[PDB]
Every structure is written in C-alpha cells, then in structure tokens.
CSV table of C-alpha atoms and ligand atoms in Angstrom, one decimal:
chain,number,residue,atom,x,y,z
A,3,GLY,CA,51.5,-79.1,125.4
A,4,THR,CA,48.7,-78.1,127.9
A,5,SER,CA,45.8,-75.8,127.8
A,6,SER,CA,46.0,-72.4,129.3
A,7,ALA,CA,43.6,-73.5,132.1
A,8,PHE,CA,46.1,-76.2,133.3
A,9,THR,CA,49.1,-73.7,133.0
A,10,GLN,CA,47.3,-71.2,135.3
A,11,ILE,CA,46.6,-73.8,137.9
A,12,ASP,CA,50.2,-75.1,137.7
A,13,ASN,CA,51.8,-71.7,137.8
A,14,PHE,CA,49.6,-70.6,140.9
A,15,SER,CA,50.4,-73.9,142.7
A,16,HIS,CA,54.2,-73.1,142.5
A,17,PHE,CA,54.0,-69.3,142.7
A,18,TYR,CA,55.0,-69.1,146.4
A,19,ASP,CA,57.4,-72.1,146.5
A,20,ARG,CA,60.2,-71.6,149.0
A,21,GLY,CA,63.6,-73.0,149.7
A,22,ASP,CA,65.0,-73.5,146.2
A,23,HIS,CA,66.1,-70.2,144.7
A,24,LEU,CA,67.6,-66.8,145.6
A,25,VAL,CA,65.6,-63.6,145.7
A,26,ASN,CA,68.0,-60.6,144.9
A,27,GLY,CA,70.9,-62.4,146.5
A,28,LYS,CA,68.9,-63.6,149.5
A,29,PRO,CA,68.3,-67.3,150.0
A,30,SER,CA,64.7,-68.5,150.1
A,31,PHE,CA,64.2,-70.5,153.3
A,32,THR,CA,61.4,-73.2,153.8
A,33,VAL,CA,59.0,-72.9,156.8
A,34,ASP,CA,61.1,-75.5,158.8
A,35,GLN,CA,64.3,-73.5,158.2
A,36,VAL,CA,62.5,-70.3,159.5
A,37,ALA,CA,61.2,-72.3,162.5
A,38,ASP,CA,64.8,-72.9,163.5
A,39,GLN,CA,65.9,-69.3,162.7
A,40,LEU,CA,63.1,-67.8,164.9
A,41,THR,CA,64.0,-70.1,167.8
A,42,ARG,CA,67.8,-69.7,167.5
A,43,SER,CA,68.3,-68.1,171.0
A,44,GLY,CA,67.3,-71.5,172.5
A,45,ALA,CA,65.3,-69.7,175.2
A,46,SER,CA,62.0,-71.1,176.3
A,47,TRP,CA,59.6,-71.5,179.2
A,48,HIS,CA,59.9,-74.8,181.0
A,49,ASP,CA,57.2,-77.2,182.3
A,50,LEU,CA,58.1,-76.9,186.0
A,51,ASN,CA,55.1,-79.0,187.2
A,52,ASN,CA,55.3,-81.6,184.5
A,53,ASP,CA,51.6,-81.5,183.4
A,54,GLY,CA,52.5,-81.3,179.6
A,55,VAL,CA,51.5,-77.7,179.0
A,56,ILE,CA,53.2,-74.3,179.7
A,57,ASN,CA,50.8,-72.7,182.2
A,58,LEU,CA,51.5,-69.0,182.6
A,59,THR,CA,49.8,-66.3,184.5
A,60,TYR,CA,49.8,-62.6,183.5
A,61,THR,CA,49.0,-59.3,185.2
A,62,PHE,CA,48.2,-55.9,183.8
A,63,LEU,CA,50.3,-53.9,186.2
A,64,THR,CA,48.4,-51.1,188.0
A,65,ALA,CA,51.4,-49.6,189.8
A,66,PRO,CA,55.1,-49.2,188.7
A,67,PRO,CA,57.1,-52.3,189.6
A,68,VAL,CA,59.9,-52.3,192.2
A,69,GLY,CA,62.9,-50.4,190.7
A,70,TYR,CA,60.9,-48.9,187.8
A,71,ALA,CA,62.3,-45.3,188.2
A,72,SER,CA,65.9,-46.2,187.4
A,73,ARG,CA,65.0,-48.0,184.2
A,74,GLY,CA,64.8,-44.7,182.2
A,75,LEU,CA,61.3,-45.4,180.9
A,76,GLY,CA,59.6,-42.2,181.8
A,77,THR,CA,56.0,-42.1,182.9
A,78,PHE,CA,54.3,-45.4,183.7
A,79,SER,CA,50.6,-46.1,183.0
A,80,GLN,CA,48.4,-49.1,183.3
A,81,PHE,CA,46.8,-50.6,180.1
A,82,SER,CA,43.4,-49.2,179.2
A,83,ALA,CA,40.3,-51.4,179.0
A,84,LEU,CA,40.7,-51.5,175.2
A,85,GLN,CA,44.4,-52.5,175.4
A,86,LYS,CA,43.4,-55.3,177.8
A,87,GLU,CA,40.7,-56.7,175.6
A,88,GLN,CA,43.1,-56.7,172.6
A,89,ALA,CA,46.0,-58.2,174.6
A,90,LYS,CA,43.7,-61.1,175.6
A,91,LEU,CA,42.8,-61.8,172.0
A,92,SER,CA,46.4,-61.8,171.1
A,93,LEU,CA,47.3,-64.2,173.9
A,94,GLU,CA,44.4,-66.4,172.8
A,95,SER,CA,45.7,-66.5,169.2
A,96,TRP,CA,49.0,-67.9,170.5
A,97,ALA,CA,47.4,-70.5,172.8
A,98,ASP,CA,45.2,-71.7,170.0
A,99,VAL,CA,48.2,-73.0,168.1
A,100,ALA,CA,50.7,-74.2,170.8
A,101,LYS,CA,50.4,-76.0,174.2
A,102,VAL,CA,50.7,-72.8,176.3
A,103,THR,CA,47.8,-71.5,178.4
A,104,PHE,CA,47.6,-67.9,179.8
A,105,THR,CA,45.5,-67.1,182.9
A,106,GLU,CA,45.1,-63.6,184.3
A,107,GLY,CA,46.2,-63.6,188.0
A,108,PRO,CA,49.1,-63.1,190.4
A,109,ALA,CA,52.4,-64.9,190.2
A,110,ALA,CA,51.5,-68.1,192.1
A,112,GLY,CA,52.7,-74.0,190.5
A,113,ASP,CA,52.7,-71.5,187.6
A,114,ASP,CA,55.6,-72.3,185.1
A,115,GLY,CA,56.0,-68.5,184.7
A,116,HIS,CA,54.4,-65.1,184.9
A,117,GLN,CA,54.0,-62.1,182.5
A,118,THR,CA,53.3,-58.4,183.0
A,119,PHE,CA,52.1,-55.8,180.6
A,120,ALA,CA,52.2,-52.0,181.0
A,121,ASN,CA,52.9,-48.7,179.2
A,122,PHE,CA,55.9,-46.3,179.3
A,123,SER,CA,56.4,-42.9,177.8
A,124,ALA,CA,60.1,-42.4,177.0
A,125,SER,CA,61.3,-43.4,173.6
A,126,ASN,CA,64.6,-45.5,173.5
A,127,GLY,CA,64.4,-46.4,169.8
A,128,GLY,CA,61.1,-48.2,170.0
A,129,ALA,CA,57.4,-48.6,170.1
A,130,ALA,CA,57.5,-51.6,172.5
A,131,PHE,CA,59.9,-54.2,173.8
A,132,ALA,CA,59.9,-57.6,175.7
A,133,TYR,CA,62.3,-60.0,177.2
A,134,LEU,CA,62.9,-63.7,176.2
A,135,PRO,CA,62.2,-66.4,178.9
A,136,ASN,CA,65.9,-66.9,179.8
A,137,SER,CA,66.2,-63.3,180.9
A,138,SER,CA,66.0,-61.9,184.5
A,139,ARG,CA,63.0,-60.0,183.3
A,140,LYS,CA,61.4,-62.9,181.6
A,141,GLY,CA,57.7,-62.4,181.0
A,142,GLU,CA,57.8,-58.5,180.8
A,143,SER,CA,56.5,-56.6,177.7
A,144,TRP,CA,56.3,-52.8,177.6
A,145,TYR,CA,54.4,-50.6,175.1
A,146,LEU,CA,55.2,-47.0,174.3
A,147,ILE,CA,52.4,-44.4,174.6
A,148,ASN,CA,53.2,-40.6,174.4
A,149,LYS,CA,51.9,-37.5,172.6
A,150,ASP,CA,53.9,-38.3,169.3
A,151,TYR,CA,53.2,-42.1,169.1
A,152,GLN,CA,49.6,-43.1,169.7
A,153,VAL,CA,49.4,-46.4,167.9
A,154,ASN,CA,49.5,-48.5,171.1
A,155,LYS,CA,46.5,-46.7,172.5
A,156,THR,CA,44.0,-48.1,169.9
A,157,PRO,CA,44.9,-51.7,169.0
A,158,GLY,CA,42.1,-53.2,166.9
A,159,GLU,CA,41.9,-56.0,164.4
A,160,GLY,CA,44.1,-55.5,161.4
A,161,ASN,CA,46.0,-52.5,162.7
A,162,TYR,CA,49.6,-52.2,163.9
A,163,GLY,CA,48.7,-51.8,167.7
A,164,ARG,CA,47.1,-55.3,167.6
A,165,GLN,CA,50.1,-56.7,165.6
A,166,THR,CA,52.5,-55.1,168.2
A,167,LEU,CA,50.8,-57.0,171.0
A,168,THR,CA,51.0,-60.3,169.1
A,169,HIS,CA,54.7,-59.8,168.2
A,170,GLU,CA,55.9,-58.8,171.7
A,171,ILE,CA,54.1,-61.8,173.3
A,172,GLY,CA,55.9,-63.9,170.6
A,173,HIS,CA,59.3,-62.7,172.1
A,174,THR,CA,58.1,-63.4,175.7
A,175,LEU,CA,57.5,-67.0,174.4
A,176,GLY,CA,61.1,-67.3,173.1
A,177,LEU,CA,60.8,-66.1,169.5
A,178,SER,CA,63.4,-63.7,168.1
A,179,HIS,CA,63.3,-61.3,165.2
A,180,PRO,CA,64.1,-63.2,161.9
A,181,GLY,CA,67.4,-61.4,161.7
A,182,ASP,CA,69.9,-59.8,164.2
A,183,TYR,CA,68.3,-56.3,164.0
A,189,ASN,CA,68.9,-47.9,160.9
A,190,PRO,CA,68.2,-51.4,159.6
A,191,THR,CA,66.0,-52.3,156.7
A,192,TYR,CA,64.8,-55.3,154.6
A,193,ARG,CA,68.4,-55.2,153.1
A,194,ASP,CA,69.8,-56.6,156.3
A,195,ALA,CA,67.4,-59.6,156.1
A,196,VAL,CA,69.2,-63.0,156.1
A,197,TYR,CA,66.6,-64.8,154.0
A,198,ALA,CA,64.0,-63.5,151.5
A,199,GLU,CA,60.8,-64.4,153.5
A,200,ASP,CA,61.7,-62.0,156.4
A,201,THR,CA,58.6,-59.9,155.8
A,202,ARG,CA,55.2,-59.4,157.5
A,203,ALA,CA,53.5,-61.7,154.9
A,204,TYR,CA,55.3,-64.8,156.6
A,205,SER,CA,55.9,-63.8,160.2
A,206,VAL,CA,54.5,-61.1,162.6
A,207,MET,CA,58.1,-61.1,164.1
A,208,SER,CA,59.5,-59.4,161.1
A,209,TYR,CA,59.8,-55.6,160.8
A,210,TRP,CA,59.7,-55.5,157.0
A,211,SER,CA,56.8,-54.7,154.7
A,212,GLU,CA,55.2,-57.5,152.7
A,213,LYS,CA,55.8,-55.3,149.6
A,214,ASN,CA,59.4,-56.5,149.6
A,215,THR,CA,58.3,-60.0,148.7
A,216,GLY,CA,55.6,-59.0,146.4
A,217,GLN,CA,52.4,-59.4,148.3
A,218,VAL,CA,49.6,-56.8,147.9
A,219,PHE,CA,47.8,-56.2,151.3
A,220,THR,CA,46.5,-52.8,150.4
A,221,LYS,CA,42.9,-52.4,149.5
A,222,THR,CA,40.9,-49.2,148.8
A,223,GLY,CA,43.9,-47.1,149.7
A,224,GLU,CA,44.8,-48.6,153.1
A,225,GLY,CA,47.2,-51.2,154.3
A,226,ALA,CA,46.7,-53.9,156.9
A,227,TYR,CA,48.6,-56.0,159.4
A,228,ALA,CA,48.1,-59.6,160.4
A,229,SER,CA,46.7,-59.7,164.0
A,230,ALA,CA,47.7,-63.3,164.7
A,231,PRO,CA,50.7,-65.6,164.2
A,232,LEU,CA,51.4,-66.2,160.5
A,233,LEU,CA,52.7,-69.4,158.8
A,234,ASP,CA,56.3,-69.3,160.0
A,235,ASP,CA,55.3,-68.1,163.5
A,236,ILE,CA,53.0,-71.2,164.0
A,237,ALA,CA,55.8,-73.6,163.0
A,238,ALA,CA,58.3,-71.8,165.3
A,239,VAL,CA,56.1,-71.8,168.4
A,240,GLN,CA,54.9,-75.4,167.7
A,241,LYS,CA,58.5,-76.5,167.6
A,242,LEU,CA,59.1,-75.1,171.1
A,243,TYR,CA,55.9,-76.2,172.9
A,244,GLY,CA,54.2,-78.7,170.7
A,245,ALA,CA,51.1,-78.3,168.4
A,246,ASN,CA,47.6,-77.7,170.0
A,247,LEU,CA,45.4,-80.3,168.3
A,248,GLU,CA,42.3,-79.6,170.4
A,249,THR,CA,41.7,-76.2,168.8
A,250,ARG,CA,38.8,-76.2,166.4
A,251,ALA,CA,38.7,-80.0,166.2
A,252,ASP,CA,35.1,-80.3,164.9
A,253,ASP,CA,33.9,-78.9,161.5
A,254,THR,CA,34.9,-75.3,161.1
A,255,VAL,CA,34.2,-72.5,158.5
A,256,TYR,CA,36.7,-69.7,158.1
A,257,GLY,CA,36.1,-66.4,156.1
A,258,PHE,CA,32.5,-65.5,155.4
A,259,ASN,CA,29.9,-67.3,157.7
A,260,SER,CA,32.8,-68.1,160.0
A,261,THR,CA,32.3,-70.5,162.9
A,262,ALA,CA,35.9,-70.1,164.1
A,263,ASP,CA,35.0,-67.4,166.7
A,264,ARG,CA,38.1,-65.2,166.1
A,265,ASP,CA,37.9,-61.8,164.8
A,266,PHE,CA,40.9,-62.2,162.4
A,267,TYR,CA,39.2,-65.3,160.7
A,268,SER,CA,35.9,-63.6,159.9
A,269,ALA,CA,34.8,-61.6,156.9
A,270,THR,CA,31.4,-59.8,156.9
A,271,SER,CA,31.8,-57.6,153.8
A,272,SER,CA,33.3,-57.6,150.4
A,273,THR,CA,35.8,-54.8,151.3
A,274,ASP,CA,37.3,-56.7,154.3
A,275,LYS,CA,41.1,-57.2,154.3
A,276,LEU,CA,41.8,-60.7,155.5
A,277,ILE,CA,45.4,-61.6,156.5
A,278,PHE,CA,45.6,-65.0,158.3
A,279,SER,CA,47.2,-68.3,158.5
A,280,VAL,CA,44.8,-71.2,159.3
A,281,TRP,CA,45.5,-73.5,162.3
A,282,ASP,CA,42.9,-76.2,162.8
A,283,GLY,CA,43.1,-79.5,164.7
A,284,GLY,CA,40.6,-81.7,162.9
A,285,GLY,CA,37.1,-82.1,161.3
A,286,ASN,CA,35.7,-81.2,157.9
A,287,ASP,CA,36.5,-77.6,157.3
A,288,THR,CA,35.8,-74.9,154.7
A,289,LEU,CA,37.5,-71.7,153.6
A,290,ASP,CA,34.4,-69.7,152.5
A,291,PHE,CA,35.3,-66.6,150.4
A,292,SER,CA,31.9,-66.4,148.7
A,293,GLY,CA,31.3,-62.7,149.6
A,294,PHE,CA,34.2,-61.3,147.5
A,295,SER,CA,33.6,-60.3,143.9
A,296,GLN,CA,37.4,-60.0,142.9
A,297,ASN,CA,39.1,-62.8,141.0
A,298,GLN,CA,40.6,-65.1,143.7
A,299,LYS,CA,43.2,-67.9,143.7
A,300,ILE,CA,42.6,-70.5,146.5
A,301,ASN,CA,45.0,-73.3,147.4
A,302,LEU,CA,44.0,-76.0,149.9
A,303,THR,CA,47.5,-77.5,150.0
A,304,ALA,CA,49.0,-77.5,153.6
A,305,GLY,CA,51.7,-74.8,153.8
A,306,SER,CA,50.5,-72.9,150.7
A,307,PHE,CA,49.3,-69.4,150.1
A,308,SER,CA,46.1,-68.0,148.5
A,309,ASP,CA,45.2,-64.7,146.9
A,310,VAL,CA,41.9,-63.7,148.5
A,311,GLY,CA,39.5,-60.7,148.5
A,312,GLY,CA,41.4,-58.7,145.9
A,313,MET,CA,44.7,-59.1,147.9
A,314,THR,CA,47.6,-61.5,147.2
A,315,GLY,CA,49.5,-64.0,149.4
A,316,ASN,CA,47.3,-62.9,152.4
A,317,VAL,CA,45.9,-66.3,153.3
A,318,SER,CA,47.7,-69.4,154.1
A,319,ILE,CA,47.2,-72.9,155.7
A,320,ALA,CA,49.7,-74.0,158.3
A,321,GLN,CA,51.9,-76.9,157.9
A,322,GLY,CA,50.3,-80.1,159.1
A,323,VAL,CA,46.7,-78.9,158.6
A,324,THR,CA,44.2,-80.5,156.2
A,325,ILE,CA,41.4,-78.1,155.1
A,326,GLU,CA,38.8,-80.0,153.0
A,327,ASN,CA,36.5,-77.5,151.2
A,328,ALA,CA,36.6,-74.1,149.5
A,329,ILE,CA,34.0,-71.7,148.1
A,330,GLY,CA,35.0,-69.1,145.6
A,331,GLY,CA,33.3,-65.8,145.1
A,332,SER,CA,31.6,-64.0,142.1
A,333,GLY,CA,34.9,-63.5,140.4
A,334,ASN,CA,36.7,-65.8,137.9
A,335,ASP,CA,38.6,-68.0,140.4
A,336,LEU,CA,41.2,-70.7,140.6
A,337,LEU,CA,40.4,-73.4,143.1
A,338,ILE,CA,43.1,-76.1,144.0
A,339,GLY,CA,42.1,-79.1,146.1
A,340,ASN,CA,44.7,-81.3,148.0
A,341,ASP,CA,44.9,-85.2,148.3
A,342,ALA,CA,41.7,-85.5,150.5
A,343,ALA,CA,38.1,-85.7,149.1
A,344,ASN,CA,37.3,-81.9,148.7
A,345,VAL,CA,34.1,-80.1,148.1
A,346,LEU,CA,35.1,-77.2,145.7
A,347,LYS,CA,32.6,-74.5,144.7
A,348,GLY,CA,33.3,-71.9,142.1
A,349,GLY,CA,30.2,-69.7,142.6
A,350,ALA,CA,29.4,-67.2,139.8
A,351,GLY,CA,32.2,-66.3,137.3
A,352,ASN,CA,34.2,-68.6,135.0
A,353,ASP,CA,36.2,-70.7,137.4
A,354,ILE,CA,39.0,-73.3,137.0
A,355,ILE,CA,38.7,-76.1,139.4
A,356,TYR,CA,41.3,-78.8,140.2
A,357,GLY,CA,40.3,-81.4,142.6
A,358,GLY,CA,43.7,-83.3,142.7
A,359,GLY,CA,43.9,-86.7,144.5
A,360,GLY,CA,40.8,-88.4,146.2
A,361,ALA,CA,37.1,-88.5,145.0
A,362,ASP,CA,36.1,-84.8,145.0
A,363,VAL,CA,32.7,-83.1,144.8
A,364,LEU,CA,32.9,-80.3,142.3
A,365,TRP,CA,30.4,-77.5,141.8
A,366,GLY,CA,31.2,-75.0,138.9
A,367,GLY,CA,28.2,-72.7,139.8
A,368,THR,CA,26.9,-70.4,137.0
A,369,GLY,CA,29.5,-69.2,134.4
A,370,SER,CA,31.6,-71.4,132.0
A,371,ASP,CA,33.8,-73.5,134.4
A,372,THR,CA,36.7,-75.8,133.6
A,373,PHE,CA,37.3,-78.9,135.7
A,374,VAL,CA,41.0,-79.7,135.4
A,375,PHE,CA,42.6,-83.2,135.7
A,376,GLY,CA,46.4,-83.4,136.0
A,377,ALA,CA,47.0,-87.1,136.4
A,378,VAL,CA,45.1,-90.4,136.0
A,379,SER,CA,45.0,-90.9,139.9
A,380,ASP,CA,43.0,-87.7,140.2
A,381,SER,CA,39.8,-89.6,139.4
A,382,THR,CA,39.8,-93.4,139.1
A,383,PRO,CA,36.9,-95.8,138.8
A,384,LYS,CA,37.2,-96.6,142.5
A,385,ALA,CA,37.5,-93.0,143.7
A,386,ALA,CA,35.9,-90.8,141.0
A,387,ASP,CA,35.1,-87.1,141.1
A,388,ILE,CA,31.6,-86.0,140.7
A,389,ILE,CA,30.7,-82.8,139.0
A,390,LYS,CA,27.4,-81.8,140.6
A,391,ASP,CA,26.1,-79.1,138.3
A,392,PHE,CA,27.8,-79.9,134.9
A,393,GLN,CA,26.3,-77.7,132.1
A,394,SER,CA,27.0,-79.1,128.6
A,395,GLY,CA,28.0,-76.4,126.1
A,396,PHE,CA,29.2,-74.1,128.9
A,397,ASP,CA,31.6,-76.1,131.2
A,398,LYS,CA,34.6,-78.1,130.2
A,399,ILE,CA,36.4,-81.2,131.4
A,400,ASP,CA,40.1,-80.6,130.7
A,401,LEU,CA,42.5,-83.6,130.4
A,402,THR,CA,45.3,-81.8,128.5
A,403,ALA,CA,48.0,-82.3,131.3
A,404,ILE,CA,47.5,-86.1,130.8
A,405,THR,CA,47.1,-86.3,127.0
A,406,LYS,CA,49.5,-83.4,126.3
A,407,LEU,CA,46.9,-82.4,123.6
A,408,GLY,CA,47.1,-85.7,121.8
A,409,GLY,CA,43.3,-86.0,121.9
A,410,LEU,CA,41.0,-88.9,122.6
A,411,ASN,CA,39.4,-91.6,120.4
A,412,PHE,CA,35.7,-91.6,121.3
A,413,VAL,CA,34.1,-95.1,120.9
A,414,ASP,CA,31.1,-97.0,122.3
A,415,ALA,CA,33.3,-99.9,123.8
A,416,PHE,CA,37.0,-100.1,124.6
A,417,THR,CA,39.0,-101.3,121.5
A,418,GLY,CA,42.1,-102.1,123.4
A,419,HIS,CA,44.1,-99.0,122.4
A,420,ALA,CA,45.4,-96.2,124.7
A,421,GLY,CA,43.4,-93.0,124.5
A,422,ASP,CA,40.0,-94.7,123.9
A,423,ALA,CA,37.1,-92.9,125.8
A,424,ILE,CA,33.5,-93.6,126.4
A,425,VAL,CA,30.9,-90.9,127.1
A,426,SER,CA,27.6,-92.2,128.5
A,427,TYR,CA,24.4,-90.8,130.0
A,428,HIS,CA,21.8,-92.6,132.2
A,429,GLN,CA,18.6,-90.6,131.7
A,430,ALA,CA,16.6,-92.0,134.7
A,431,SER,CA,19.3,-90.8,137.3
A,432,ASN,CA,20.4,-87.9,135.1
A,433,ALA,CA,24.0,-89.1,135.4
A,434,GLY,CA,26.7,-88.8,132.8
A,435,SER,CA,30.2,-90.2,132.8
A,436,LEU,CA,33.4,-90.1,131.0
A,437,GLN,CA,35.6,-93.3,131.1
A,438,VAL,CA,39.0,-93.3,129.5
A,439,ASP,CA,41.4,-96.2,129.0
A,440,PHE,CA,44.8,-94.4,129.1
A,441,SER,CA,47.0,-97.5,129.4
A,442,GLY,CA,45.3,-99.6,126.6
A,443,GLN,CA,44.1,-102.9,128.1
A,444,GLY,CA,40.5,-102.4,127.3
A,445,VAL,CA,39.3,-101.4,130.7
A,446,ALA,CA,38.8,-97.9,132.2
A,447,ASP,CA,41.7,-96.6,134.2
A,448,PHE,CA,40.0,-93.1,134.6
A,449,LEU,CA,36.4,-92.0,135.4
A,450,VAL,CA,34.6,-88.8,136.0
A,451,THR,CA,30.9,-88.7,136.7
A,452,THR,CA,28.5,-85.8,136.4
A,453,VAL,CA,25.0,-84.7,137.2
A,454,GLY,CA,23.8,-83.6,133.7
A,455,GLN,CA,24.6,-84.9,130.2
A,456,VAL,CA,28.2,-84.5,128.9
A,457,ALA,CA,29.0,-84.2,125.2
A,458,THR,CA,32.2,-84.9,123.2
A,459,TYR,CA,32.7,-81.2,122.6
A,460,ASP,CA,32.6,-80.5,126.4
A,461,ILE,CA,35.9,-82.3,126.7
A,462,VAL,CA,39.4,-80.7,126.1
A,463,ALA,CA,42.1,-83.2,125.4
B,1,CA,CA1,53.2,-76.9,183.2
B,2,CA,CA1,38.1,-78.0,162.4
B,3,CA,CA1,40.1,-80.8,158.4
B,4,CA,CA1,33.7,-67.7,141.1
B,5,CA,CA1,41.2,-83.7,146.3
B,6,CA,CA1,31.4,-70.6,138.1
B,7,CA,CA1,29.1,-73.6,135.3
B,8,CA,CA1,40.0,-85.9,142.5
B,9,ZN,ZN1,60.5,-57.4,168.3
C-alpha cells in the first residue's frame, strides 16, 4: 500500500542489513560481532609511557637483520622508494582512525617498533607479519621474486597497496576473520569478504558486491567498515581526524588518495571515518544510477559499482550530491542537504529539517513518517518544479489519499496547499491526527499543486 518510489527507498535501506539471517548456511554477523572476531587473539600494543596513544616507530630495513639467514626467506632487499611512499599512506590510513601514531626512526619511550623489508623465497605467501604479542612483534615482510611482482608496484586501488594495509593490520593485533587450500567456504560468517574487511582473503563477489568496472577489478586501499570498528575497539577512536567540514568523492577536501575521485570512470572503494563538522559525500561526477545512504554503518552503490562505499559506525555525514543518473538519496536523523543533480531522483530526508534539491529531471521527495517534517522542523524543497516533481506521502497514508481543503475541518487526512507569491514560497500542511491543526508541514521554493502530491 505504498508507491514504488517508497518501496525502492525502503528496499535499498535494508539491502545490506546484517546480523539477522543466514547466507548459504553461514551466519550474518553485525559490525560489532566482527570487531570481536578480528581481535580474538587478545594481542595488542601497550601504552608503556601512559600518554594515551600508541606511539610506534618504524624502519625500512637497509640490511638483513641479525639471524636473517637461518629464517629460510631467501634474498633480502630493502623497500624501493615507491614501496616506502605507499607504506606511509597505508600507515596514515590506520592512524587516521585509531589512536596509534607511526614515526619513521630507530627503536628508541616508544611503545613499540616495526620494520618492513622484502624477501624472495615463497613459503605459501605473498607477505606475512607478526602480532604484537610475538617475539617478532612489529615485523612485516613482503614477497618479491621473478614470478610474483605485485608487491613491487603498490598503488591506490591495487593489491600491492591492499597487502600493505592488511599486514600492518596484523602488526596492530588484527587476525584474519577466520582460522585460515582454504576458500570462502571455510569462512565462519557471511561477511568474511573484501567488501567488509581488508583482513579477509575472499573476493567481494561471494557476498554480491560488484567492484569491477570497464573490465577491471579493484581493491580497497584503506581499512574498511569492520576493520575500523576492530582497531577502534583496541586503541580507541581518533576523533581529531577531519574534524572540520570535509568533502569526500569529487572535489574532495579529505587529502587522501582513496577518498578522491577525479573522473567518471574512477573505482571508489572506501569506508568513511570522520571526527566532526558538516560533511558531504560528493558523487556528482558519475553518470550511472547511484544509491546513496547517509545512515551510519550503511553501504551505498556508487559510480556504477555496488556496496563499495560505506560510513563507519559512529560517524554522522550530513550531505550528499548525486550524479547525472537516476539516483536514490537517503538522509539520516540530522538536518541534511541532499542534491539529486540531473536525472529522475528519489530523495528521502528522514528525521530533522532537511534541505532538498531535486535538480533537473522529475524528482520524488519521499516522506516515510510524520516526524520527518513537522511544523517546527520542516523540510524545504529549494527547487520544486510543479508538474515535474512529486511529494510522496504514501508510506504515511498507505494510499488512502488526502482531503484538500482551505481550512482544517477537524478530520484526519485534511491538507492545505498554499502559495505566498511575494516570497515565492509554497507549503503543504496536513492534519494527520484530526484535531484541526497541522501535525506535518513541507515548504518549497516554487508553487505546489494538488496534482504534484502522491498520497
Ligand atoms: Ca604511548
Ligand atoms: Ca569532517
Ligand atoms: Ca559530520
Ligand atoms: Ca541524479
Ligand atoms: Ca534528515
Ligand atoms: Ca534530478
Ligand atoms: Ca526536478
Ligand atoms: Ca526531514
Ligand atoms: Zn594476513
């Protein structure tokens, strides 16, 4: 008993729900359950000088360490200049989210020390690291030989960069999501894939995400939604990161390669961690149909891909700009600025007084409950175009319709449409409860007609 516009919003908002169903015999785990699974060894660095932060030093080894030859690791080599630069962006991506700092220098008052280097012999792997409770705590080692060259050219979005972020995650105390010729079949929970954690080994295709674009597949460079909860559980959240207004995506002001898009063919795979301010997800440069959800902990389908963008638990992102495609935009309980751009968009501000822009195209502004837009905290539709855009109240009315009148009559379902020509301001007031006063209000820039309302 709802329009198709509201059903699309509602289906998308629950599409990646977790924790309440099986997937092919595996239990779906919430983010908090994963945070405990990823930290189940109990190993972590300690705050030895009690200053409230894990302060670690690291060194790119230039010579084989003491005892290296008996390790069975083959030829030693130091990191190249490109491996160092990438390793520093990976370390920064972890320090952004949790209260751990990494400074290049000799083991000195440090809570711990890390080393990075290359080896040539394969022992079953591309790279390996030790947890912080081991006698080789802080070490991580990367394979480089004539048959495996991926670690020589790490770059944003490729597996060499992901491998760095992943091995640093182990040096911080994170384990693989499962105790692992293993495959996704050995996963313990359904979300053990690289759409939720960079610690997993399994392709995101197992959980349905589409990360491939123009024939090629990508890898998240930085910690993903579950990784952020796991490392924040060990060391605390870093609330100073990006604490002023920030833009992610196109026109990014985040200053991180994995949060920036500069063309419509870019493959973004990221989870947003942000410590404060009035922030915007800007995806205006894509022309594919996108589905954008501002709810904390949720996933969006951006740039022609699916399940590739998420917002970390605990973060409030306020604004979102869609692209030239027909998009879905879901706001959260704060006051949001939501812009559809070209295309026929469906926009749902949710709680709070939102500022809605449909852009060109026939857009639908969707209202799922009376508290979405009340006389004291009413949405405004800034570019309402009568005859083209629609205001949709069917989730509330269940298609019972409205009674349009000039003054409240005292019956539930009465509605008044007015227009103030000197300020070019329209409004829709509805008395859903029936006491002859408005319980619901939406305002617009531009006249609104009775036929622009779906109820
Ligand atoms: Ca410390
Ligand atoms: Ca911010
Ligand atoms: Ca914010
Ligand atoms: Ca659009
Ligand atoms: Ca809102
Ligand atoms: Ca539009
Ligand atoms: Ca429009
Ligand atoms: Ca609202
Ligand atoms: Zn690993």
